[PDB]
Design a protein around this ligand. Sequence first.
Ligand SMILES: *[C@@H]1O[C@H](CO)[C@@H](O[C@@H]2O[C@H](CO)[C@@H](O[C@@H]3O[C@H](CO[C@H]4O[C@H](CO)[C@@H](O)[C@H](O)[C@@H]4O)[C@@H](O)[C@H](O[C@H]4O[C@H](CO)[C@@H](O)[C@H](O)[C@@H]4O)[C@@H]3O)[C@H](O)[C@H]2NC(C)=O)[C@H](O)[C@H]1NC(C)=O
Ligand SMILES: *[C@@H]1O[C@H](CO)[C@@H](O)[C@H](O)[C@H]1NC(C)=O
Ligand SMILES: *[C@@H]1O[C@H](CO)[C@@H](O)[C@H](O)[C@H]1NC(C)=O
Lengths: 50, 50
Amino acid sequence: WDPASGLNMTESQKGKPANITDSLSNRSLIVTTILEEPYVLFKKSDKPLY
Amino acid sequence: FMSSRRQSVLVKSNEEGIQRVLTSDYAFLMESTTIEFVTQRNCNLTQIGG
Ligand SMILES: *[C@@H]1O[C@H](CO)[C@@H](O[C@@H]2O[C@H](CO)[C@@H](O[C@@H]3O[C@H](CO[C@H]4O[C@H](CO)[C@@H](O)[C@H](O)[C@@H]4O)[C@@H](O)[C@H](O[C@H]4O[C@H](CO)[C@@H](O)[C@H](O)[C@@H]4O)[C@@H]3O)[C@H](O)[C@H]2NC(C)=O)[C@H](O)[C@H]1NC(C)=O
Ligand SMILES: *[C@@H]1O[C@H](CO)[C@@H](O)[C@H](O)[C@H]1NC(C)=O
Ligand SMILES: *[C@@H]1O[C@H](CO)[C@@H](O)[C@H](O)[C@H]1NC(C)=O
């Protein structure tokens, strides 16, 4: 620790180096989709939509 | 339909529901115990559905 710097941890704990793994996830599945009526026609909502 | 045009089709009374049927081309949805009072003192109006 250093009042100027802060915690400079030596976080490496190589007694057991391999620690954790994560999970592949949602990815949101980008759908290429054009507008055609009555399929993907726009809304007549009286506000901006997201 | 009503969420699109939610300033013009929606009156705020049972009275303005009567008048805009009598003047405009308008199919106001009233409670059935008031339709039985309106369509028996104003014989130019009616009750469409069940
Ligand atoms: C002794 O000498 C020192 C330096 O020569 C003088 O200054 C004091 O010491 C340090 C250096 O300036 C100051 O510490 C800092 O305090 C911040 C507090 O945030 C606010 O707190 C209140 C609101 O709650 C305000 O009144 C105040 O002005 C601050 O804006 C910390 O948030 C600072 O950031 C970092 O802190 C540590 C790293 O040190 C980590 O947690 C983070 O990295 C964080 O970002 C910083 O620590 C201190 O405030 C100075 N003043 C005082 C009064 O102590 C001293 O004046 C001098 N004399 C005495 C008596 O101490
Ligand atoms: C913390 O110590 C290491 C070891 O040399 C080095 O990265 C540096 O001195 C310190 N890190 C930072 C961000 O200051
Ligand atoms: C219904 O309205 C018309 C005008 O739109 C009017 O002439 C007629 O008298 C009304 N019917 C009754 C029973 O008053």
